[model samples]
Target: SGFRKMAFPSGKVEGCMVQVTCGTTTLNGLWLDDVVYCPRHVICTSEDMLNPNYEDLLIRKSNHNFLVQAGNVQLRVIGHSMQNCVLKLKVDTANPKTPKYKFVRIQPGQTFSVLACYNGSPSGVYQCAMRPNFTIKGSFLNGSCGSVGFNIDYDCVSFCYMHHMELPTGVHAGTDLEGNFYGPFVDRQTAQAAGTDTTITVNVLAWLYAAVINGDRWFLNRFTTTLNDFNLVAMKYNYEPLTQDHVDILGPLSAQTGIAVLDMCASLKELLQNGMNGRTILGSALLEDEFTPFDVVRQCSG
Candidate 1:
């Protein structure tokens, strides 16, 4: 860069090429700028290649960031807006040495990587939820499994959907990578019309999440729904109807189950419309699960 051998131009040079010297390296100078001077740009994640490779180099609030390590999968905080969210992590009672609870938060936007070659069992159960709000949304740990699931109370605040509220593979649908439930499970049943009743539990959440991910493309391929499109319609809680792309997705599993899921959304919409949330609807019924006989285009109505 100090000096270059030059033959004086005999005629007009059509265009010029530029170069910049940084120490010993000469770089093509079209795009390089002053970011090279910042130390954060040069910095990298502390995690090795195995963890999610968080790579937004210049993001702020590096100290407030939270990382969840559940086996090989991670659900790192991705800032959606200017919301200053903080998470509290509480290790399950099994870990006596560590503090029972800890807190972490991330800068309002940031971005990480990885799929495991094999599953890694988490060392302890850690419960996390956003604050200063999570006064009571229960936490549970079953067996030796860790409970790092952030049962977040997703808010009605964002202009865009808080899609992260959808299960992270990090969420594991309340299971690990192997499709097994994490312990201290809750069990319920959705009775099959003809066969044995189906057991519903936390495992269903994973399947439900998977259904939501796949259906947007799947329904777009089919005749689009005339009412609300399966995935697109929910703007916020009690926002009229329920979003049930997963219902139709599961219908193919069992034909009757489609109607079953429809009844669920129907009941959900009914409850939401009436401004009610509780066990006792106190409506005229013996069992509410049997709600009504598919009311949407039924013969009782026009």
Candidate 2:
């Protein structure tokens, strides 16, 4: 039941009014005492809250010395250390038609942005690799730099949570923006006893990549089920068959589920494309049955 406390200065300041002390060094600065200093205590460690692979991508070390942030249509690679670094932005597939090969070099204390957007209906999927060695144009690297990929749809939200490898009461529990209290339950059995299941939702791209990389069949199957549900909803809205173009768009997703994820994304995109068309179809059907707006609203409310 113990927790950790983290304190920092808060509020408006006129100048350099903050001081920090680590061990023997009481850093000299105009320490401000006029602001309300808020302190937060939490029962969690960095390892407990981060994805095990996260540090490999975002955190800087003496050897790695870089950080990356994947965005909606761009990726930002930052060189944190006083060393030069090279990054390769490449499409994870073979013979990509859009030409997905770019090399970037970041000087110390510099950041580089790559316009790596997938310019399709939904978007394309791409990955950034920290290259150990490579030429700006055509050259091979002697070793492998770490690679990370993300999808546009999955780029909608970022979430933080305690790692589920070991669960403790009050560990991963919190309220959502909707003001719904979720969990503080001790374990799965505790949640089940209360007639509910403990659940943790993750970004689609993150989950898919992790499942594929780690070869986690159980989680992959669960991901397939979730995609199936998403496709079902899409079909209900657009009532259209999948196309060859759509199938091709899903090729990258076949790494694990053999085109299942691609099919779902295609169907979802079709539903989105038929936005006004689908609505018009629904209105026509209702009008043919002599249902007015008031009647439809009343039925829906009822």
**Top TM-score model:** 1
Stretches off by above 4 angstroms in model 1 are 1-123, 126-226, 229-245, 252-260, 275-302
lDDT of 2 by residue, 133-213 (tens): 110111112110111111121112111111111222222221111212223322122332122221111112222332333
lDDT of 2 at 209: 30
Clashing pairs in 1: 52-113, 53-113, 64-105, 65-105, 125-146, 142-183, 142-184, 168-171
How accurate locally, in lDDT, is each candidate?
0.22, 0.23
Give all TM-scores, in the order shown.
0.22, 0.18
Write the residue-wise lDDT of candidate 1 on 246-276 in tens digits.
3444454324334344433443334334533
Per-model RMSD to reference: 24.1, 23.7
Q: Which stretches of candidate 2 lie over 4 Å from their true place?
A: 1-169, 172-198, 201-205, 214-302
